[PDB]
Amino acid sequence: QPNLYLSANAAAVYSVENGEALYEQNADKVMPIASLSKLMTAFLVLEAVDNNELSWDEKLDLVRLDDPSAVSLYAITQKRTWSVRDLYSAMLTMSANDAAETLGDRLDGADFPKEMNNQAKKLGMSSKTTFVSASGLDVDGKSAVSTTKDLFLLSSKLISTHPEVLETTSKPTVTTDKGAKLESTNDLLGSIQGLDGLKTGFTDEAGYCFIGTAERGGKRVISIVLDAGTAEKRFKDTEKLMEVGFK
Ligand SMILES: *C(=O)[C@@H](NC(=O)/C(=N/OC)c1csc(N)n1)[C@@H]1N=C(C(=O)O)C(=C)CS1
Secondary structure (H helix, E strand, O other), X not given: OOOOOOOOOEEEEEEOOOOOEEEEEOOOOOEEOHHHHHHHHHHHHXXXXXXXXXXXXXXXXXXXXXXXXXXXXXXXXXXXXXXHHHHHHHHHHOOOHHHHHHHHHHHHHHHHHHHHHHHHHHOOOOOOOEOOOOOOXXXXXXXXXXXXXXXXXXXXXXXXXXXXXXXXXXXOEEEOOOOOEEEOOOOOOOOOOOEEEEEEEEEOOOEEEEEEEEEEOOEEEEEEEEEEOOOOHHHHHHHHHHHHXXX
């Protein structure tokens, strides 16, 4: 294993072909993951469409967040009603917390965190992973937590089960049918060849986090960065991890 000098406190990169570690640092350490939880919500949304339980065209009113200063789709647009499709894009591109919570409530109401943790178990994530909400926001003072190993297993399961997730996470901007522009938080899109995902997150406690995925020559790698120092440094660590991934 090479010696990287990452900003991140915990980090890794894995090959999807065999799941094997190409670089690992604190890969078993339980870490706050915040907005990365929205990948589980996306997965459960996609499962529900395949299972004939959710329509992409259903219109839903955004649920109201307790904190106004939270990053929310409603704050930016002043529009309450959105299709399931647009809420899912809004969740994945701009990390809209109210979008994620609206999808969680529609899927299972108050039991949605249990469904998230049920699915975590199905996908092979260890018991150190705990989801608390569809958006990744704290609930009753409890935080969503995971490990870079469990995040890898979740991400590759998401991409292998629902490859169309990347059709959304590869776009620097998603334009809805009615013309709303939803800007991705993934500034590495277009900077690294093959890069088409996956999800950013940030809290004071979690630091700056990003799950990256790229594919070249039939080889896919997934990179995990938790608790980088700045929004830019999580992408610098990811650039470093991707080079190790495609060596
Ligand atoms: C996911 O992590 C989201 N993070 C939050 O909603 C925050 N939670 O703190 C309790 C938060 C605090 S401060 C701040 N700017 N967000 C989304 N993650 C980011 C990101 O990756 O930088 C977004 C740009 C919107 S919120």
